[PDB]
Structures are given as structure tokens and as C-alpha cells.
Design a protein around this ligand. Structure first.
Ligand SMILES: CC[C@@H](C)c1ccccc1
Length: 164
């Protein structure tokens, strides 16, 4: 397992514009197009992202290219953030994937309220961190995915993903 396989499991793959769990227009492997209610706005974002007139549909190669870009952006986001970088650097490779997963899903913004979880992770208090992470809108709104990510932080193994 690696971060691409993990996020592919969590995000799925769809080649036509769809609405994500929050109701936002998305495509490919969890590529958010816009939070605007306008499908036309989403189509325009898609054409800009891909560099051609897509009419709301892309190829698998194009989906995977956006995915590479999005994973890269998530990692860069972590490295540029003074609150996240030190915790990320303290983690082993498997737990780093769990961190990237969260940032991919919620952004640096959506992770703002996780100060206490960040501290517990930095302290390697894995069970405590796991309990804290579940006390979140994140956990309540996407509990199956959150449980997988939290298990990954708790154990430092891929046990939650190995079966899929
Ligand atoms: C706890 C928030 C998540 C995005 C994280 C965890 C450890 C290091 C960086 C980010």
C-alpha cells in the first residue's frame, strides 16, 4: 500500500462530474471542481484544469493526472504549514499517508480545529490521538473513511485497507 492506493480506495474513480459527500461538484479521484451550485461553473473549472473542452467527462489518464497533482499539492501544503510540518516530520511513513489523506479530504483549512490531535500525534500517544480524532464533524460525516484513517494513525499499519 501507498498513498495513491489508499486515496484511490477512499475517493473512488468516476470519469463524469459527480457530487461528493458534501454535495460539491467533483470528478476523477476526488478532484473538487467547485463549491458553487452551478454545474456550468464546474464545467468551466474542469475545462481549465484539463486544458480542453471536456463537456463534463474526462479519461482515466486525465483523472490520474489530476490525482498526481492533488496528492503533490496535499504534501506541499503540509510542508509549507508551520503547524503541520513538524508533526508530519515526526511520523513514520505509514502514518504520513494518513496525514496526507486528511489534508487531501479537508484541506489545510478543514484541519484547523485539530490542534489537540496534532499534539497527541507529535507525542506518539496513538490511542489518545485516535479517540480525539473521532470527536469531529469529519468522523461523524464520513465515519467509515475516518475509521480507516484513524486506524492507520493508531497502528501505523495498513490493516484497515489491506482487505479494502
Ligand atoms: C491531524 C491532522 C492531519 C492533517 C495531520 C496529522 C499529522 C501531521 C500533519 C497533519
Amino acid at each position: 500500500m501507498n498513498i495513491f492506493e489508499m486515496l484511490r480506495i477512499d475517493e473512488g474513480l468516476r470519469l463524469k462530474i459527480y457530487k461528493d459527500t458534501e454535495g460539491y461538484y467533483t470528478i476523477g479521484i476526488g478532484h473538487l471542481l467547485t463549491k458553487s451550485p452551478s454545474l456550468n461553473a464546474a464545467k468551466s473549472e474542469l475545462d481549465k484544469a484539463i486544458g480542453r473542452n471536456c463537456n463534463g467527462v474526462i479519461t482515466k489518464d486525465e483523472a490520474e493526472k489530476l490525482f498526481n497533482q492533488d496528492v503533490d499539492a496535499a504534501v506541499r501544503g503540509i510542508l509549507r504549514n508551520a503547524k503541520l510540518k513538524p508533526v508530519y516530520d515526526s511520523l513514520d511513513a505509514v502514518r504520513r499517508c494518513a496525514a496526507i489523506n486528511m489534508v487531501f479530504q479537508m484541506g489545510e483549512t478543514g484541519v484547523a480545529g485539530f490542534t489537540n490531535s496534532l499534539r497527541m500525534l507529535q507525542q506518539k500517544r496513538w490511542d489518545e490521538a485516535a479517540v480525539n480524532l473521532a470527536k469531529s464533524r469529519w468522523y461523524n460525516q464520513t465515519p467509515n473513511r475516518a475509521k480507516r484513517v484513524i486506524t492507520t494513525f493508531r497502528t501505523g499499519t495498513w490493516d484497515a485497507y489491506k482487505n479494502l
